[PDB]
Amino acid sequence: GLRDTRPGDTWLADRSWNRPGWTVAELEAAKAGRTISVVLPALDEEDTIGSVIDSISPLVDGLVDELIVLDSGSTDDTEIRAVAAGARVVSREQALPEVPIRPGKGEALWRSLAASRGDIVVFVDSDLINPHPMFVPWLVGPLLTGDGVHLVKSFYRRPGRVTELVARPLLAALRPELGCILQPLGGEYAATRELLTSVPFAPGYGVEIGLLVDTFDRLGLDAIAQVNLGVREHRNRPLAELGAMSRQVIATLLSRCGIPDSGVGLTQFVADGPEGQSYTQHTWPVSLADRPPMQAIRPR
Amino acid sequence: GLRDTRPGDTWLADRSWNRPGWTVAELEAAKAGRTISVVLPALDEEDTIGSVIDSISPLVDGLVDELIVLDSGSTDDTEIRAVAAGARVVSREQALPEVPIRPGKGEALWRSLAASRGDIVVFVDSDLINPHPMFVPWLVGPLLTGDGVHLVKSFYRRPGRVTELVARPLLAALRPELGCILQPLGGEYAATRELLTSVPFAPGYGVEIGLLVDTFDRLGLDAIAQVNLGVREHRNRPLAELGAMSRQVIATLLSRCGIPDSGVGLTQFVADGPEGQSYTQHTWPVSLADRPPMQAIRPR
């Protein structure tokens, strides 16, 4: 199974593999009333967002009913380049005006649920370097082929740290049944509205891991599927930021397991010089504050 | 305080700093009946162990009463080179013959307590590249200056991953008072026999973190001190092994916080080729089995 996996292959919970034998046009016919939205979270991604939209553009009005870029308050030319590429840009303010804004990635994806319409929502990171046009079709594949799948995660390889050292070892310890998930923190995934609007949304970088665990806890492993995207390349995350990401992943995962987190942020001690004669104390923020299920805020 | 710290400076719990104003000969007089042992855990370290012993050698018969190398069943020339350097080599079998051997670093340090004699035991890794001769004197410093210190941890800088992404963020979440510890996983530390033989010893790579938390939980932060070793350089740990280390650090830390760990090892999925057409499934072992306080096995 894992000894022969092509980009597009689905791995179900019962250790069974499913190789897709459809075209894009055939998948559109398999929708049968169900609508598909694609959401792209964006914070200062002016260089990459054009290319990401272009790979999903030809699917619009066909398989994809709406392509939305959720602007997380960008100060650069992210908005004007995304419109020029042919996607509707909705800011956090515009997505849900009647609720004050909290910082972080989790807030943006949560708000995109109120801004989107589709029965199936596809999430793709806007910092992906040259994504394959079949990314979206592969993600919706297991959902449109009705077999009780509600969340489609993705796995890939670089042409890592927090996934391999924090997320996955902690999942092995606390939710061992989720040990088969190759990329729990992966930003490329698809889910049904009925699931997305019924679960709370974790703040910041904990959004992916929280959604994965909530899906497993309330539906079981059978509702989760994994698709091979082949080779994924994205903007490299700065090494200083990974400690903060880890702490948030930890906070979110502990809260889902009923383990009380102190709410105390990670303090990093950065050496000022080569000798190490002095250290800079830097405390990253951490949030234990989930957003409630969207059904409690804006019921569709 | 952290804006001016020279190699040797002690950081106490009450955020107060102590700069040492002694010589090696003056520290020996401060012992007053108390004996000091230095333990070097060794598993296949034939290239580095000679240099490590040479830095501690001139202290023997003076400040250091005995220098012991705890051989963890080496297959190379670790034993014969350590004897030639001038240190007594005790294997796991010889350290505690009447108890069967378990694999891992934690077992070795635990067994060294039965093989050692000193009221103060100093632990130094045998894979250190050119350690400073003042390493041992700096570690025993706060212990010999009687102010209620029972464990001396160390901090340094490279001339990281698991410390910065796993150990420290998880300590912030579960034991926030230990957030000021710069290197919780550091192999260079010293403690009193009364403490070391009264606490359980965590298996494998969890030994350091377990000892830190046990000391805090039963004595408080006042018993823990930190010393600047300046610049530390050691053999680089292979990137494939760090996931296994993380899982063990996680298992040990959760167990100390009363959080049930599943006992399921981390499964890593390693890509076989460039395309990612197949994956190798690799499950690292994890142990939830502590060793009991040495007072329950060999009471001195």
Swiss-Prot record, chains A, B:
Reaction catalyzed: an NDP-alpha-D-glucose + (2R)-3-phosphoglycerate = (2R)-2-O-(alpha-D-glucopyranosyl)-3-phospho-glycerate + a ribonucleoside 5'-diphosphate + H(+); (2R)-3-phosphoglycerate + UDP-alpha-D-glucose = (2R)-2-O-(alpha-D-glucopyranosyl)-3-phospho-glycerate + UDP + H(+); GDP-D-glucose + (2R)-3-phosphoglycerate = (2R)-2-O-(alpha-D-glucopyranosyl)-3-phospho-glycerate + GDP + H(+)
Record carries keyword Magnesium: yes
EC id: 2.4.1.266
A GO term, aspect molecular function: glycosyltransferase activity
Residues reported to bind (2R)-3-phosphoglycerate: G160, R161, V162, T163, N236
Quaternary structure note: Homodimer.
Functional description taken from the UniProt entry: Involved in the biosynthesis of 6-O-methylglucose lipopolysaccarides (MGLPs). Catalyzes the transfer of the glucose moiety from UDP-alpha-D-glucose (UDP-Glc) to the position 2 of 3-phospho-D-glycerate (3-PGA) to form glucosyl-3-phosphoglycerate (GPG). To a lesser extent can also use GDP-Glc but not UDP-Gal or UDP-GlcNAc as the sugar donor.
Annotated family: Belongs to the glycosyltransferase 2 family.
NCBIfam families linked to this entry: PRK13915.1
Protein name in UniProt: Glucosyl-3-phosphoglycerate synthase
Organism, scientific name: Mycolicibacterium paratuberculosis (strain ATCC BAA-968 / K-10)
